Amino acid sequence: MQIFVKTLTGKTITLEVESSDTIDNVKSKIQDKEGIPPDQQRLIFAGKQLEDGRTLSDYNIQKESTLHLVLRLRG
Amino acid sequence: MQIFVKTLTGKTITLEVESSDTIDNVKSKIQDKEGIPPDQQRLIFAGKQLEDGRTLSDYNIQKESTLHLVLRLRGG
Amino acid sequence: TIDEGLYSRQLYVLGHEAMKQMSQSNVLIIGCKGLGVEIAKNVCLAGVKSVTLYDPQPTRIEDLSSQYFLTEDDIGVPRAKVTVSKLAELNQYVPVSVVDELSTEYLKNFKCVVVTETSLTKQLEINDFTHKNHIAYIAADSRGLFGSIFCDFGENFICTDTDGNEPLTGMIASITDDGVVTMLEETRHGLENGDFVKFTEVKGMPGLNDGTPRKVEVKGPYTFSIGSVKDLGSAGYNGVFTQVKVPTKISFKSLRESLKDPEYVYPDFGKMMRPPQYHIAFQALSAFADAHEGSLPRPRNDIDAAEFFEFCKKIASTLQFDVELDEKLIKEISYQARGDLVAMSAFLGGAVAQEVLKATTSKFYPLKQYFYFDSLESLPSSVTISEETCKPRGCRYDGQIAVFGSEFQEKIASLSTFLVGAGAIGCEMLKNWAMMGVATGESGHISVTDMDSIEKSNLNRQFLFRPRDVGKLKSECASTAVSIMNPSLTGKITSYQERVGPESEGIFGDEFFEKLSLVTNALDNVEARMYVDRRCVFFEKPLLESGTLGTKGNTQVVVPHLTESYGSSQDPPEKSFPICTLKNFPNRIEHTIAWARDLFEGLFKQPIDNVNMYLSSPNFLETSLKTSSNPREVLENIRDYLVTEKPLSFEECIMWARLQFDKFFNNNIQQLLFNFPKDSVTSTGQPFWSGPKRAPTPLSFDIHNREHFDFIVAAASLYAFNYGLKSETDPAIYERVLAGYNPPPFAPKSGIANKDKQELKSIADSLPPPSSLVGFRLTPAEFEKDDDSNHHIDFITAASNLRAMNYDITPADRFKTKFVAGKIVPAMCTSTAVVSGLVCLELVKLVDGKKKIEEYKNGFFNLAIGLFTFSDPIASPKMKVNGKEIDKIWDRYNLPDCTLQELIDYFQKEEGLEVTMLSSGVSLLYANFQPPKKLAERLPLKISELVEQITKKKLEPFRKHLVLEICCDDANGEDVEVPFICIKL
Amino acid sequence: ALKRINRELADLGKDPPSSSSAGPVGDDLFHWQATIMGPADSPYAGGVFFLSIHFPTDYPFKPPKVNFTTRIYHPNINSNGSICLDILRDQWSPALTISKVLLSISSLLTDPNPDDPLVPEIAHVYKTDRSRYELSAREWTRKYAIG
């Protein structure tokens, strides 16, 4: 299937993924396309932060879902 | 090569370096061990203040050398 | 029973126990020349029990070279007798006495014995006695540009504190079964191998909370090890650790034993072969004096130098010293034997006084044992220094002419200096200038500026000011004092009460600065230092910077076209806590003190200012309704402080204080715990109130408790001061009023159009009209730490301790609260003396006009550990502009007051650069991206007209130049840095 | 400070920030007014938030003072506009540009952090009753961030 990742600058990146794909694979694709290290990627879907070791299906991610890519800041 | 850095407050630091390292590498190591940004570090060896862009061999800094890490003070 | 009103800044360096031990110690000082009088002055200011002087030698004229308590009317009188009367005034708690004769058995009355201007045989005789009777012995010597110190505190000296640092403390995150202690996220413990620590509040390993120190094995910046804790438990969570500082035993050798095998302290690592030379040289000096009826070698005399070098050879052979003697250096020591410089005396006196305090307090690490110093790079090279020019003239400057000569004395006498600040360093600098004879010639002049007034706490280290001077301007008093010290300065000193900054450029303008020879900073803040540095860079004047902090100090020199400026380097900035940490989740007493200061400002300062501005500005409400970030807050403050909560007696002030106690220590905590219950968890399942977040608990008001009553008293008193009521301190009225208080009910609120503007209008029109209140004002409270009767520090302490009790933090006392809230800088007289000595040693280099950068020294020192270090100044960076060598700092463009178009065309044609940005002050005069209409309007105007138009403010009549910053691009489009522009109006 | 500020301004002009637009107020280089666009997939969608930036005299060696001027219903932004951002209080370094600060603020708007809040009541509403928080945020952005 296909998904969309929106960045802080308004850019939209389209990715071809499967519901069984791990979060790590998506972060790897984002690193390959944008060069952003996975450690600095903060992926958000429906108000929940995606965690490594899980799959897209774990978050009920379906056809043409939209994710957010943000920085890691806490304070 | 192993060198020692003494702070103005009495602390001692041991650094593992090589004669070909630049002063920037030494300042980065000091930042790692102390958290002092390289641009705020004042290093003195044998009456010379070490400047960025040069190497240790430029100052004849050899093994077991002692550097001083100093800073300015605002009172008076 | 230490008088904290006088020793305020010194207690933050030493402490109460150290000063208590000091106040029970006697100091004997042998010799009353410049070095001896400096030591005695520093000791008297420090606060020892008493000082005794022994110097029966009649006064001589040359002695006035560094003795500032001697006048030309005292010639022929013993120095001690004429010095004791002036020394007795420095401190009223320290008696000063004189003994006409010394016997060995008389030395048992003194805690410390300082020896100056004494032969080596007498020093051996005195030390042979003091060593076996456990009396601290210090011997100091100053010969020209050379100095020596020797310390012997006994074979079993006990040092309780070896570096003067506060004990290290930190918050733990986890302790494994093998003792691997880990700090919280991104937190450094800062320990070293061999330290000792004790733990508290450790959960899972109660055994670590007993309080037994444990060895530390540092394994990284974030973790360390304490050993095997297998028995005490499997794992520990959270907790805090505190460093334990253990006493050390230092063993000294006698002078007789240490002459053969000395132990050196090196003030400079660039010259590590010299101290062995000076060791022989000073002994040779003593032998020469013994062989010539106590007469030292004559200045720049070759026969005496040859004889002295023969003595040096003999001594070196006798001691089996396997050192090759440097003939030039030793003969230099011979030539300047009769030199007596006030700068060297100040430097060595500061060091020796600090050593005396170490001996009497058993604190800080003492010198062990020989400290030989030289400033031979200060010897002039632009004048003739020979036997003819260095011979005495029978004047008070003989001690200095014996080193520098008469021509250099003429050069010094015609200086035109500018001293910024008149504090401790300012007073020391003025004293040094008076003794050196600065500005006593026809064309000499001194200018000193300082806008502050003398206070009681300043008398501890500003020896030119007396208790009768409290409340007067520092500059006038300092100028009068130095004119008394050196009468030749009468009419050569001008004192201003102006702050040096952007607002005083009309007084310290182009004409004032064009006549100076150098500028010396004696400030205590970085903003003024940067401003004066920029002014000196623009006018190309030498600058002497210096600073102190407790026992640490530094001195720097800025030389035009040679070195970088003061602002070319960056220092660590002040630490400000996150707003969220202060607002809701404090974990240190500093956080609660900051919160208490903000509370003080918000209760007694801001509402009063709003009320006063409402009753003065006729259009305040309309401007505030769209200017401030919370007009509702302003309206509420005005209403509450005018009508709703205006007190009519002191009882209403007490009730208001009780209400504020409830508001800030009982209700906000209940609301916070309603929002985040103690059992709540984060989004990851972890407990919320864990680690840096401490669960608070509401306080219930109890009148008998001390902190609650202190808060009530301070708050009621400050409110009464705001409304001008008559406060009281008798507990009876407080206990009677607070008895009949019924707390309003409180229940935390769960929450759940344009009418708000209508409510704001209704509130605004409900306020009494300004016309009804004419001549009525509320007095705001301006924070003042140095007064112990305005309740400011009392209120801040009470509020901070109550908020600490909320979050279970360890409360502090008034001393620490005043230190933290007041931003007090610890200060000492010894550090001031040392920095003044170094600055005056650099001043003679500046006067000689030395060109090479290796002849100047920036100095750093820490007297608590006996560390001195020097380094050459950094040369100013160079650059290439249009294939030309340009100094990034000291070079500028000089252009007439042309038009903007003409300036751009000049930069295009001459430098081959395209101007992209042009700014002046804090305004953008020109930018390449501005719309064509704006540029076409602004192009044909002169620079002065353009600046006046953009800044909407006419240039002052005294303004003679403009400084412009310009950013330009080359032909290829590469940005190239250029120096600033100086437009001549 | 002037040269650093002008370099930042020119860099902003060359490559547009797209989602932000900062520039000096009038002709004063030490007082900027920036604009931030509410993320589309967030409660603040279709909202324009104005920020005031005050550069200190020591820039870039001290952080700029950034304050929201539009009212926003966020767990980390209080009624005075103060923003709970690490890089603005004690993590500031002389290597961060205003564009980075604007990106940080936009990220903060896109997802709040209720575990270390500045407004405990909004954080509590966010943690417990999410739908009410969404409704309140939409109401506030419609009431203040539009118009």
Ligand SMILES: Nc1ncnc2c1ncn2[C@@H]1O[C@H](COP(=O)(O)OP(=O)(O)OP(=O)(O)O)[C@@H](O)[C@H]1O
């Ligand atoms: N911008 C300035 N222009 C002129 N003089 C200044 C300026 N800033 C500070 N000073 C003066 O510099 C001196 C600083 O010395 P010092 O810090 O020892 O004094 P203080 O601030 O009065 O004392 P303390 O810090 O012990 O409370 C003071 O006279 C202060 O008035």
Ligand SMILES: [Mg+2]
């Ligand atoms: Mg003062």
Ligand SMILES: [Mg+2]
């Ligand atoms: Mg001060």
